Amino acid sequence: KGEELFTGVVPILVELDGDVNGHKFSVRGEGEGDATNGKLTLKLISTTGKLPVPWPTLVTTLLMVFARYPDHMKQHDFFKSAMPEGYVQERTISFEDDGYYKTRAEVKFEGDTLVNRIVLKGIDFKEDGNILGHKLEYNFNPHNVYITADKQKNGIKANFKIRHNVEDGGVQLADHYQQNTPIGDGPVLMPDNHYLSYQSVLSKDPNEKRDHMVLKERVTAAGITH
């Protein structure tokens, strides 16, 4: 039922309101998602001028509903089953030897468009660290995100470490703890243990004047025998 909303290409709107060490910023993005092929593309633009944090640190915050679930794994796709009323996606992201983000997003249909509307707060960052000092490379590594059922809350949980490449070599770890809960009252799918395999490519639109990120992601569910 929820899954039937994703058989074709779905327009996406992303809106983020952010505040990191008191520096406020807003991002607005548009794009399209193709769950059949496990892919999405977004062009994300700062609407407040130069962003105060590196774009790669916002990649995970800025749509697991577009994962491709293989035919033998369809009964494990919580994310589409919560549609169209949607789900809340909440995270704490702890940056090693630095500050943390807290995010709350609602992912839901508004008419024909899938919207991801986020509030992000960042606390306790070092003015000289890799984040506020902009020392992270403009790229993104592949990661596996493990999904577990959270039956008591009718939702799912995930925790995973993101490795950000640092400009002069080295990595900056960002430890993510995530909880997703349905917005509606209707039944959702509680999944067996599996994971989502993510690939992400960051680029720039050479003709765009504003601070921005072009994000292309490929996401495939995996890990269930058969």
Numbering used by the authors: 3 to 64, 68 to 231
Q: Could you share sentences copied from the article?
A:
We report the rational engineering of a remarkably stable yellow fluorescent protein (YFP), ‘hyperfolder YFP’ (hfYFP), that withstands chaotropic conditions that denature most biological structures within seconds, including superfolder green fluorescent protein (GFP). hfYFP contains no cysteines, is chloride insensitive and tolerates aldehyde and osmium tetroxide fixation better than common fluorescent proteins, enabling its use in expansion and electron microscopies. We solved the crystal structures of hfYFP (to 1.7-Å resolution), a monomeric variant, monomeric hyperfolder YFP (mhYFP) (1.6 Å), and a cysteine-free mGL variant called FOLD6 (1.2 Å), shedding light on structure–function relationships underpinning their brightness and stability. Through structure-guided engineering and screening based on GdnHCl unfolding kinetics and melting temperature (Tm) alongside rigorous spectroscopic characterization, we produced a series of avFP mutants demonstrating superior stability over sfGFP in diverse biochemical assays. Each FP crystallized as a monomer with no asymmetric unit.
We next targeted β-strand 7, the most structurally heterogeneous region of Aequorea victoria FPs (avFPs), to engineer variants with further enhanced stability. Introducing the S147P mutation that was reported to improve thermostability in violet-light excitable uvGFP21 yielded hyperfolder mutants with considerable resistance to 1 M sodium hydroxide (NaOH) solutions of pH ≥ 13 (we were able to determine hyperfolder FP extinction coefficients by collecting alkaline denaturation time-course data). hfYFP-S147P/V206K/L195M behaved as a stronger monomer in the OSER assay than did hfYFP; the L195M mutation originated de novo from a PCR error. We named the hfYFP-S147P/V206K/L195M variant ‘mhYFP’. mhYFP further demonstrates that diverse stability-enhancing characteristics can be structurally engineered into FPs with minimal perturbation to spectral properties. The V206K mutation (on β-strand 10) largely preserved the GdnHCl stability of multiple mutants. Using structure-guided engineering, we conferred the NaOH resistance that we first identified in FOLD6 into hfYFP and enhanced hfYFP’s monomericity in one step, producing mhYFP whose spectral properties are identical to hfYFP’s. We tested the same FPs that we compared in the other stability assays and found that none could tolerate OsO4 concentrations used for CLEM except mEos4b, hfYFP and mhYFP. We subjected eGFP, mGL and mhYFP to a modified electron microscopy fixation protocol (4% PFA and 0.2% Glut, followed by 1% OsO4 and embedding in agarose and optimal cutting temperature (OCT) compound—that is, polyvinyl alcohol and polyethylene glycol) and quantified the retained fluorescence.
